[PDB]
Design an enzyme around this catalytic site. Sequence first.
Site, PDB file in Angstrom:
ATOM      1  N   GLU A 154       4.666  -9.163   4.236  1.00  0.00           N
ATOM      2  CA  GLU A 154       3.687  -8.413   5.670  1.00  0.00           C
ATOM      3  C   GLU A 154       2.396  -9.210   6.397  1.00  0.00           C
ATOM      4  OE1 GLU A 154       4.975  -5.859   7.058  1.00  0.00           O
ATOM      5  OE2 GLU A 154       3.474  -4.341   7.110  1.00  0.00           O
ATOM      6  N   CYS A 187      -5.919  -1.947  13.189  1.00  0.00           N
ATOM      7  CA  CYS A 187      -7.230  -1.970  12.890  1.00  0.00           C
ATOM      8  C   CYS A 187      -8.025  -1.097  13.918  1.00  0.00           C
ATOM      9  CB  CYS A 187      -7.805  -3.149  12.713  1.00  0.00           C
ATOM     10  SG  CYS A 187      -7.085  -3.947  11.466  1.00  0.00           S
ATOM     11  N   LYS A 244       4.210  -6.987  15.194  1.00  0.00           N
ATOM     12  CA  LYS A 244       3.543  -6.686  14.246  1.00  0.00           C
ATOM     13  C   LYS A 244       1.944  -7.168  14.316  1.00  0.00           C
ATOM     14  CE  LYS A 244       1.770  -6.045   9.793  1.00  0.00           C
ATOM     15  NZ  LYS A 244       0.654  -7.086   9.214  1.00  0.00           N
ATOM     16  N   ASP A 246       3.195  -7.466   0.302  1.00  0.00           N
ATOM     17  CA  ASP A 246       2.194  -7.122   1.216  1.00  0.00           C
ATOM     18  C   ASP A 246       0.578  -7.960   0.106  1.00  0.00           C
ATOM     19  OD1 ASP A 246      -0.403  -7.073   2.577  1.00  0.00           O
ATOM     20  OD2 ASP A 246       0.808  -5.041   2.844  1.00  0.00           O
ATOM     21  N   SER A 300       5.773  -2.190  12.233  1.00  0.00           N
ATOM     22  CA  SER A 300       6.190  -2.870  11.299  1.00  0.00           C
ATOM     23  C   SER A 300       6.233  -3.304  10.513  1.00  0.00           C
ATOM     24  CB  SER A 300       4.326  -3.233  10.586  1.00  0.00           C
ATOM     25  OG  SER A 300       3.025  -3.082  11.130  1.00  0.00           O
ATOM     26  N   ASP A 335      -0.097  -3.729  14.426  1.00  0.00           N
ATOM     27  CA  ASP A 335      -0.586  -3.432  13.542  1.00  0.00           C
ATOM     28  C   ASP A 335      -1.928  -4.189  13.116  1.00  0.00           C
ATOM     29  OD1 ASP A 335      -2.096  -3.315  10.872  1.00  0.00           O
ATOM     30  OD2 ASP A 335       0.219  -3.361  10.555  1.00  0.00           O
ATOM     31  N   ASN A 336      -2.388  -5.366  13.322  1.00  0.00           N
ATOM     32  CA  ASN A 336      -3.022  -5.647  12.832  1.00  0.00           C
ATOM     33  C   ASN A 336      -4.584  -5.968  14.260  1.00  0.00           C
ATOM     34  OD1 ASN A 336      -1.376  -7.247  11.704  1.00  0.00           O
ATOM     35  ND2 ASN A 336      -2.533  -9.470  11.230  1.00  0.00           N
ATOM     36  N   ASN A 390       4.348 -10.708   8.988  1.00  0.00           N
ATOM     37  CA  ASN A 390       3.187 -10.642   9.715  1.00  0.00           C
ATOM     38  C   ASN A 390       3.237 -11.839  11.600  1.00  0.00           C
ATOM     39  OD1 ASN A 390       0.131 -10.134  10.075  1.00  0.00           O
ATOM     40  ND2 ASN A 390       0.489 -11.864  10.691  1.00  0.00           N
ATOM     41  N   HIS A 448      -8.047  -8.568   3.727  1.00  0.00           N
ATOM     42  CA  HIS A 448      -7.325  -8.173   2.079  1.00  0.00           C
ATOM     43  C   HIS A 448      -7.325  -8.023   1.014  1.00  0.00           C
ATOM     44  CE1 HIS A 448      -2.850  -7.592   0.587  1.00  0.00           C
ATOM     45  NE2 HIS A 448      -3.434  -7.897   0.398  1.00  0.00           N
ATOM     46  N   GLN A 477      10.034  -4.821   8.321  1.00  0.00           N
ATOM     47  CA  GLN A 477      10.289  -5.050   7.888  1.00  0.00           C
ATOM     48  C   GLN A 477      11.544  -5.127   6.800  1.00  0.00           C
ATOM     49  OE1 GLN A 477       9.161  -6.134   4.931  1.00  0.00           O
ATOM     50  NE2 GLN A 477       7.053  -7.067   5.516  1.00  0.00           N
ATOM     51  N   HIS A 530       0.790  -1.294  -0.072  1.00  0.00           N
ATOM     52  CA  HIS A 530       0.240  -0.157   0.116  1.00  0.00           C
ATOM     53  C   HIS A 530       0.880   1.596   0.211  1.00  0.00           C
ATOM     54  CE1 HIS A 530      -3.780  -2.950   1.183  1.00  0.00           C
ATOM     55  NE2 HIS A 530      -2.775  -3.483   1.925  1.00  0.00           N
ATOM     56  N   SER A 577       1.739  -0.647  -5.498  1.00  0.00           N
ATOM     57  CA  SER A 577       0.594  -1.077  -4.397  1.00  0.00           C
ATOM     58  C   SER A 577       0.342  -2.180  -4.388  1.00  0.00           C
ATOM     59  CB  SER A 577      -0.419   0.385  -4.076  1.00  0.00           C
ATOM     60  OG  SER A 577      -1.336  -0.326  -3.190  1.00  0.00           O
ATOM     61  N   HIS A 595      -3.648   2.552   8.558  1.00  0.00           N
ATOM     62  CA  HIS A 595      -3.250   2.781  10.451  1.00  0.00           C
ATOM     63  C   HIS A 595      -2.220   3.676  10.837  1.00  0.00           C
ATOM     64  CE1 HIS A 595      -5.166  -1.388  10.213  1.00  0.00           C
ATOM     65  NE2 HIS A 595      -3.397  -2.321  10.360  1.00  0.00           N
ATOM     66  N   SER A 635      -5.380   1.748  -2.679  1.00  0.00           N
ATOM     67  CA  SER A 635      -5.344   1.981  -1.044  1.00  0.00           C
ATOM     68  C   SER A 635      -3.705   3.048  -1.192  1.00  0.00           C
ATOM     69  CB  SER A 635      -4.713   1.246  -0.220  1.00  0.00           C
ATOM     70  OG  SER A 635      -3.077   0.256  -1.650  1.00  0.00           O
TER      71      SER A 635
HETATM   72  N1  NAD Z   1      -6.964  -3.902   6.944  1.00  0.00           N
HETATM   73  C1  NAD Z   1      -5.627  -3.646   7.505  1.00  0.00           C
HETATM   74  O1  NAD Z   1      -5.204  -3.536   8.367  1.00  0.00           O
HETATM   75  C2  NAD Z   1      -5.430  -5.213   8.259  1.00  0.00           C
HETATM   76  C3  NAD Z   1      -4.243  -5.391   8.941  1.00  0.00           C
HETATM   77  C4  NAD Z   1      -3.502  -6.774   8.865  1.00  0.00           C
HETATM   78  C5  NAD Z   1      -3.984  -8.511   8.556  1.00  0.00           C
HETATM   79  N2  NAD Z   1      -5.033  -7.605   7.710  1.00  0.00           N
HETATM   80  C6  NAD Z   1      -5.683  -9.120   6.820  1.00  0.00           C
HETATM   81  O2  NAD Z   1      -7.119  -9.263   7.520  1.00  0.00           O
HETATM   82  C7  NAD Z   1      -7.197 -10.473   6.860  1.00  0.00           C
HETATM   83  C8  NAD Z   1      -7.544 -11.237   8.882  1.00  0.00           C
HETATM   84  O3  NAD Z   1      -6.511 -10.614   9.977  1.00  0.00           O
HETATM   85  P1  NAD Z   1      -5.771 -11.405  10.910  1.00  0.00           P
HETATM   86  O4  NAD Z   1      -4.806 -10.919  11.687  1.00  0.00           O
HETATM   87  O5  NAD Z   1      -6.923 -10.926  12.061  1.00  0.00           O
HETATM   88  O6  NAD Z   1      -6.306 -13.102  10.600  1.00  0.00           O
HETATM   89  P2  NAD Z   1      -6.435 -14.052  12.027  1.00  0.00           P
HETATM   90  O7  NAD Z   1      -6.227 -15.636  11.154  1.00  0.00           O
HETATM   91  O8  NAD Z   1      -5.449 -13.596  13.441  1.00  0.00           O
HETATM   92  O9  NAD Z   1      -7.857 -14.026  11.888  1.00  0.00           O
HETATM   93  C9  NAD Z   1      -8.912 -13.985  11.155  1.00  0.00           C
HETATM   94  C10 NAD Z   1     -10.011 -14.971  11.729  1.00  0.00           C
HETATM   95  O10 NAD Z   1     -11.008 -15.347  10.737  1.00  0.00           O
HETATM   96  C11 NAD Z   1     -11.804 -16.824  11.223  1.00  0.00           C
HETATM   97  N3  NAD Z   1     -12.953 -16.924   9.792  1.00  0.00           N
HETATM   98  C12 NAD Z   1     -12.053 -17.743   9.177  1.00  0.00           C
HETATM   99  N4  NAD Z   1     -12.711 -18.098   8.629  1.00  0.00           N
HETATM  100  C13 NAD Z   1     -14.350 -17.772   8.657  1.00  0.00           C
HETATM  101  C14 NAD Z   1     -15.427 -17.399   8.265  1.00  0.00           C
HETATM  102  N5  NAD Z   1     -15.591 -18.357   7.119  1.00  0.00           N
HETATM  103  N6  NAD Z   1     -16.576 -17.586   8.534  1.00  0.00           N
HETATM  104  C15 NAD Z   1     -16.041 -16.552  10.437  1.00  0.00           C
HETATM  105  N7  NAD Z   1     -14.585 -16.865  11.052  1.00  0.00           N
HETATM  106  C16 NAD Z   1     -13.833 -16.819   9.938  1.00  0.00           C
HETATM  107  C17 NAD Z   1     -10.542 -17.192  11.176  1.00  0.00           C
HETATM  108  O11 NAD Z   1     -10.894 -18.159  12.119  1.00  0.00           O
HETATM  109  C18 NAD Z   1      -9.845 -16.287  12.172  1.00  0.00           C
HETATM  110  O12 NAD Z   1      -9.334 -16.419  14.004  1.00  0.00           O
HETATM  111  C19 NAD Z   1      -6.391 -10.862   6.698  1.00  0.00           C
HETATM  112  O13 NAD Z   1      -7.074 -11.157   5.173  1.00  0.00           O
HETATM  113  C20 NAD Z   1      -5.191  -9.840   6.627  1.00  0.00           C
HETATM  114  O14 NAD Z   1      -4.634  -9.954   4.998  1.00  0.00           O
HETATM  115  C21 NAD Z   1      -5.886  -6.064   7.238  1.00  0.00           C
END
Ligand code: NAD
Lengths: 427, 427
Positions: free
Chosen positions: A153, A192, A183, A128, A356, A187-188, A178, A298, A360, A51, A74, A348, A79
């Site tokens: 990432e 968020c 991180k 990422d 994060s 971050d996550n 990650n 993602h 990297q 991003h 990106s 973020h 983004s």
């Molecule tokens: N928006 C952002 O800034 C940002 C930051 C980090 C990660 N992400 C993305 O967000 C997503 C989640 O990241 P994370 O670190 O929380 O992952 P994670 O694996 O820690 O959490 C995902 C959760 O979703 C649950 N899940 C899976 N399938 C499901 C379903 N059908 N119904 C309900 N729950 C379900 C899993 O059991 C798990 O607990 C990923 O795609 C990651 O790349 C986004």
Amino acid sequence: QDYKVAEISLADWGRKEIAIAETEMPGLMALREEFSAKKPLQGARIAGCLHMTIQTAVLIETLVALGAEVRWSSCNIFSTQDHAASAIAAKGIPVFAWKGETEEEYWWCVEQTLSGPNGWTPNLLLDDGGDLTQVVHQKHPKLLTAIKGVSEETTTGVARLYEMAKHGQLKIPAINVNNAVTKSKFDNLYGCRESLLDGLKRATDVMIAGKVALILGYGDVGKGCAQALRGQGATVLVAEIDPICALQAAMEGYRVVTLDDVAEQVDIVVTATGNYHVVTHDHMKRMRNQAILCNIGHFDSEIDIQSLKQYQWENIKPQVDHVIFPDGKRIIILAEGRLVNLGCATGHPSFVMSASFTNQVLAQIELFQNSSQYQNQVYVLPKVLDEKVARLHLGRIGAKLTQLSNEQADYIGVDKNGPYKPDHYRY
Amino acid sequence: QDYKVAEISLADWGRKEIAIAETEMPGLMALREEFSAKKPLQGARIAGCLHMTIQTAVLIETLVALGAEVRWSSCNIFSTQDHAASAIAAKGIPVFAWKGETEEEYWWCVEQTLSGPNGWTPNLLLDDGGDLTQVVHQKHPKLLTAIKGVSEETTTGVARLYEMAKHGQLKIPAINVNNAVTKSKFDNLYGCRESLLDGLKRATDVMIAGKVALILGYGDVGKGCAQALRGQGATVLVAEIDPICALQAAMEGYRVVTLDDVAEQVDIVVTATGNYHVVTHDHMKRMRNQAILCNIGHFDSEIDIQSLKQYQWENIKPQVDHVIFPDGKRIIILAEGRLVNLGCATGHPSFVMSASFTNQVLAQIELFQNSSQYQNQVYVLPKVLDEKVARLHLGRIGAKLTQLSNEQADYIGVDKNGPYKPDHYRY
Ligand SMILES: NC(=O)c1ccc[n+]([C@@H]2O[C@H](COP(=O)([O-])OP(=O)(O)OC[C@H]3O[C@@H](n4cnc5c(N)ncnc54)[C@H](O)[C@@H]3O)[C@@H](O)[C@H]2O)c1
Ligand SMILES: NC(=O)c1ccc[n+]([C@@H]2O[C@H](COP(=O)([O-])OP(=O)(O)OC[C@H]3O[C@@H](n4cnc5c(N)ncnc54)[C@H](O)[C@@H]3O)[C@@H](O)[C@H]2O)c1
């Protein structure tokens, strides 16, 4: 011009916000102070797919200050912050990114980082989400031999690496950034916890208080989202497939429910699963008039956006759309189902992106220097570096560490300077 | 009488509260329903050293219903609930535990579990804090050869096992029950989030709201304690030696400070470090009149109680004492620095103890059946069993799990029935 951006004249605005972000990113500035003279990345040629934000510009210039040459794209069509990309482009750094790319333009931009003037080719990938990794493995396998490795990432990208390794498709070492603690658990989660609200509020004048909000997924991202909305007075529902994460949500006071059951009851739906088609056509048909639907995972494939192709899309403002159902009911979809915090807001804040991105930079240094010690598998950085990342961020927020005495270090079986926890401690 | 308890006539009261606790402990009751006919622990001879509470009585009777013979002692001089011990004693189960043991009586009680009538000796240890493990290794090494292994409940006990292994002192396999996710992230966290307040409020009429409260340590226990006091309106300070845990506390809005700096500013001090002499004489001298000092970590050595030997101790009520300093200033010390939630109250509630103790039962089954496959090292139970523990507790609190479709399981690289996370996922 070895770059492609929207308006280069936004560069001065980007520089101003970059200067501000530097003061919120002590991890990256500390790596410059530690390493910019020795230039540990002299000779590094990094293709980056992440991003193109103001915070990422500070990452890019840290890599450059450490001696790297980079080419950047990106990892999402919405983004990019155009003024961040412009500031980078004005420095002469090749960058191919603008907000609102088409999918064809998106993949063209990724392709531009794989080759530069004078036979420039990368020897390092910084990814990422796994798209750059996918492109190199599937379409430029000649590049793989000279690539020392990739640092990845996000959770979805690591999941793709794991599946490649399982099937023997992974042909370079991979560093899982990650799952550095500094991180995933920052971050996550905390990122968020703030940036979901950012996107929701910029997109709509919807009040959170009194609403019923459903979070799909209670991993690190969903945990932050739930905290965010609960603090603002929503009734927060959680869906989970994982019984441990479900039990965590229940122990925080959230009712754990299925979208199949509750589609008619929700005002706001946030997908945070990393999974595929967790919101289907029937769910969206069942949702109340003016219900708000967004994705913070993602890929936009968390929502079956394809099922809405034949309905009228009435644009409200950029990245905010009405989808009108044949019975007249409307739903509000944010950023066409793409990452809402980065599509409808700015992602973020700087402080947590610093943790994060310090990870990297350290992964890139380690791959560039020691890729020979790694096989074609997924690795994480050692805990001593994870603790260093946290240490570098304590001063900014005024946190004062207690020092172990000799008998206290011995009592719990640690060195006074760390690492302080066993390898599988979960924090 | 092959038992020693305070008053056996309290047994009927203990039975009544045990019946109530069973309805809050679905993990243990499910193991009875699954296993009580096959009796997988027939032939098991368990020496147990774990707080003799109402919840532990449900653990004991689950082991017995599965075929085990046990002999039980408590792992703290104040943590026994006399009526729980009596209910167990009335069933004919050998138990040696009462509230308010002397240290001599404490170690005599542990010794009683190592031998029974007719040459009874254990072939399994169930430990909470490492004292029983210590006694066997250091004083009855003849017993070690017939001991199949030990399952250990708490962070401090695992730390002691790690140090034994490092130095070649560990002579049996060990299962680390603390670091099951459904233990550390539930018992330590949510359990203490409720039971710290229990002990504080039973001990004193001190209001939490408006107080400045300092938590030493921000691991799983300290995280729960901080949440507890913050919810009740205290200003919460945190001390940490670990920069990652410090950064977590700071990102939750706690000022991270040293007790050396803040001793004069605090109304309440809670030690949660697992470490040695984190509260010293000078700290306590500096504390304000009527300041409250307690320990929620495993051993009273978190506080240098020895430094108070020459001051008058004026008892307020059982386990609540004034220590009067020569300048007339007084501090309130809870349970003589022993575990405050179990010394001044009744420990964690039944529901979360069920998750911990279901893990204990599964570890005992695994050691009894398969100890031959283990070396003299520390192990954890596999994630499939951790997920089973969570699954067994979802129904009680009405949480409804979503089921993955086939394409969704494939998309994230998991089996539909789990396990759902990589081995080093931190939740
Ligand atoms: N928006 C952002 O800034 C940002 C930051 C980090 C990660 N992400 C993305 O967000 C997503 C989640 O990241 P994370 O670190 O929380 O992952 P994670 O694996 O820690 O959490 C995902 C959760 O979703 C649950 N899940 C899976 N399938 C499901 C379903 N059908 N119904 C309900 N729950 C379900 C899993 O059991 C798990 O607990 C990923 O795609 C990651 O790349 C986004
Ligand atoms: N009371 C209960 O019901 C209960 C339940 C579980 C565990 N415990 C006990 O509580 C203690 C902590 O357990 P945990 O799971 O939180 O352990 P943990 O290791 O997760 O947390 C301990 C924390 O204390 C910090 N620390 C160590 N020395 C310190 C010092 N001098 N100053 C400040 N911080 C310091 C460490 O960095 C660590 O983050 C252990 O003794 C454990 O056995 C009690």
